[PDB]
Design a protein around this ligand. Sequence first.
Ligand code: NI
Length: 341
Amino acid sequence: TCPFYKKIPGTGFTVDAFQYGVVEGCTAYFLTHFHSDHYAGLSKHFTFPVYCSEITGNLLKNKLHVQEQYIHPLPLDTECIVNGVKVVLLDANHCPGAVMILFYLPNGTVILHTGDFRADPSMERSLLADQKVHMLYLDTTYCSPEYTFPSQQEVIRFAINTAFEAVTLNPHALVVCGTYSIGKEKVFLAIADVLGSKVGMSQEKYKTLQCLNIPEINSLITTDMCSSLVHLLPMMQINFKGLQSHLKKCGGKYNQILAFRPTGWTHSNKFTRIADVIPQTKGNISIYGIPYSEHSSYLEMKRFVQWLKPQKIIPTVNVGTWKSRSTMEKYFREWKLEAGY
Ligand code: NI
């Protein structure tokens, strides 16, 4: 049954709640983004209205075959009326098509549901600046002070410089990048751009990227692996056995692999700087784990919440254990006493 933190009081609405059957009283099902733990349950047999971004709507139609008559895409940064209630979708700085949702309840309460997000100071100048928010349904994935990681720009600078150095020393080196969901496309696109190559990938992954409204995409990606020297593979193949096997498939065109795994956080973060990251190597294969996050760091999350000053916080991540729930509640109170709301 549907947990409370997925239901929006005073409405017929749920958020990211497609795996519980027909939810009692739900007139509209919102989907924040196209990641499997959030869309789990959707398919071509779904017959209720789905509210989402244009990009998420492209993926529901093409990848899951949801019928068009049930897909309701909304433009961003625009006041819209859904079943009698004003809503706005805001960019969540997560994966492509990911949104936060502002609900303006008939009784005067305002609720922000962040979906999955990476907080940024630019959000302080969106439509959030313009009224009070009473209740915040918060992506708490990294809500603990140990979770530090660099900016996305520092991480991409590292990746581009590493790849261009390796391939210029050895023009017969192949670069491979792992993936298992949408998001983090900057990693492989930035590396292919510095090398003067398109990115090569499977038909299934190419289809997925063609749903994303990325400018000039036909110029950046391809299904012809033979023409490309940056390949995308499933994340599960980014290990020495999977990579040796891939190199065999390339018919002696290459003699070395440099591979990237864009992880979220890994405890190498608590000691080591981005400058200092080193790979795991076996023979002519090197694998770099790089800390490219699409969720808030602890400090980014804290700045957002202290700026927004909500009256009540509802976590949506790490809610399964009493120890986690107690830890998060303690940081919420610290933040509130430090800032004075
Ligand atoms: Ni996500």
